[PDB]
């Protein structure tokens, strides 16, 4: 998909083996914010959302929270609180045939800055503050949707980089996607199974200190009332 309409894909009810993506054919960058690229294997997540779009090798650094530029504030903006991974790889063989196969429409201008996680489909004409455009595109009336214009003989800063952005959410709901390790709640305690009142929608319990004190058993619906290990002064 193009940059102005990036594909948002929902995945669920599957085990995600991230390790094969971690070590594979050469990805140009692997920058994970708020999630360890190494320790990701023993994790469970509540939702995984992919953002597939194609950019050049120059503005890959702009796909990161906290910076501005030409694309990060006009086409795709990540939140300041961002827990996710960014991937990118060269696509000189899969794309960029000679002749300008530019179905890579990206928006040039926007009225104001972009709030995070927003797509723009409408192709209305740009600002024209002095003279209203009135639906024409003669002069001082630019079509904001722009083709990238890729060539296979271009420089290394002008190569199509297929960018997939994965966004997760950590330990705040029932988890549907997990790692390859043989409901994702991890901790240390003593199982003291009792009759806690399970409401039909409940999935975890919490104490006064906002820590885990009761955990729903992943197989059966009874309650594992966890208890911290016995300790004291000697």
């Amino acid at each position: 998909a193009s940059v102005y309409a990036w594909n948002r894909k929902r995945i669920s009810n599957c085990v995600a083996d991230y390790s094969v993506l971690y070590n594979s054919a050469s990805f140009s960058t692997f920058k994970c914010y708020g999630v360890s690229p190494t320790k990701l294997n023993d994790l469970c997540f509540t939702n995984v959302y992919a953002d597939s779009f194609v950019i050049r090798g120059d503005e890959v650094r702009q796909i990161a929270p906290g910076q501005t530029g030409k694309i990060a504030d006009y086409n795709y903006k990540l939140p300041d609180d961002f827990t996710g991974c960014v991937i990118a790889w060269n696509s000189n063989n899969l794309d960029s045939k000679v002749g300008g196969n530019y179905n890579y429409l990206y928006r040039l201008f926007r009225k104001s800055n972009l709030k995070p996680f927003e797509r723009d489909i409408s192709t209305e004409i740009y600002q024209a503050g002095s003279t209203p455009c009135n639906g024409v595109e003669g002069f001082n009336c630019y079509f904001p949707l722009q083709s990238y214009g890729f060539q296979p003989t271009n420089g290394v800063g002008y190569q199509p980089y297929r960018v997939v952005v994965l966004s997760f959410e950590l330990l705040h709901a029932p988890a549907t996607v997990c790692g390859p390790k043989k409901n994702g709640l991890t901790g240390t305690g003593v199982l003291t199974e009792s009759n806690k009142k399970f409401l039909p929608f409940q999935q975890f319990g919490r104490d006064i200190a906002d820590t885990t004190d009761a955990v729903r058993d992943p197989q059966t619906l009874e309650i594992l009332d966890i208890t911290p290990c016995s300790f004291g002064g000697v």
């Epitope: 030409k70 429409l105 024409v136 595109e137 003669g138 002069f139 001082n140 630019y142 079509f143 949707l145 722009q146 083709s147």
Partner: antibody, heavy 123, light 107 residues
Amino acid sequence: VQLVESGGGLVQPGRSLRLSCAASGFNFDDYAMHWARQVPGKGLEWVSGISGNSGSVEYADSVKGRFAMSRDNAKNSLYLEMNSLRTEDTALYYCAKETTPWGIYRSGGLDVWGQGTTVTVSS
Amino acid sequence: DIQMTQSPSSLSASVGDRVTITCRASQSIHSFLSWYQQKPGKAPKLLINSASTLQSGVPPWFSGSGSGTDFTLTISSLQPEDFATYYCQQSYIAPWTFGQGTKVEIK
């Protein structure tokens, strides 16, 4: 791609002197045709321009309301009407077609250049 | 509009050295600029479009870059067939303006 200009000559400032730039070797499309001028001895200046689906005419800052434009795509010829001439208009006129008739990014045109007719406005 | 200024107004260089040419806009211009070359008594020819894209028929020793307002242009090695004048031209808004010129001569 060949651009042939004609119509220039000696003219007292005040009367009309109509010129034309012939367009040949150019397929019919929605390219934007612009004018250009240059007084000898220094750099260049831009005069006018016409884009697709008619209308959309514009001139430079100090030449408002004294030139007239008409484009005929059937004859493949360009017409500019001269009115209210002054002494500073002595230049050689250049015609450009800018050769990027794509719906996305029509601007940033590669200004082609013909031979260029010369107008001598002497008092 | 747009007030276009260029520096320096004149220069002298030999064959094979390094010369930097810069133009400066009065406002945001992003990247809509063109690099032009003008021999005396000859037709113009575009070299660099949008300040970073090479044109067809131009060998890659002409390299220009820049963003925002201030720009730059770096010549890798000079030849006997480049001693001419230079201007900056934009394509943003209501009537465009050219540069004032910069001449390079034999020293």
